[PDB]
Design a protein around this nucleic acid. Structure first.
Length: 49
DNA sequence: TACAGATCGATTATGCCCCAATAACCACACTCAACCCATGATGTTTTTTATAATGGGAGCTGTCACGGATGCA
């Protein structure tokens, strides 16, 4: 339960869901990110990615 | 006959003993703290356990790319 709770809420890929519009809802749930565990960082990422 | 005054008798002044309050000054007091010294309940620390136990890595870290030294071999 500790590990699953840390992933659900304390991880980078789980963040508060935007609720301004239904469009914001859809475009936040249909989102692809290249960060988080095993991914790049904004400082590290160059140009090709 | 015309014209005068003259004493009874009234409002006004000026001062003070009392005195019905005025204020300071001095006398005695109860209640409420303050600190202390216990009794004891709670708290904190120390000591010992005898079948046998004999080498983790803890999660790596996930990957940019310059320059300038730098310590070698």
């Amino acid at each position: 339960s500790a590990a699953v709770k840390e992933f659900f809420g304390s991880s980078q890929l789980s963040q508060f869901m935007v609720q301004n519009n239904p469009l914001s809802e859809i475009t936040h749930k249909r989102r692809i990110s290249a960060l988080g565990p095993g991914g790049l960082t904004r400082e590290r990422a160059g140009f090709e990615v």
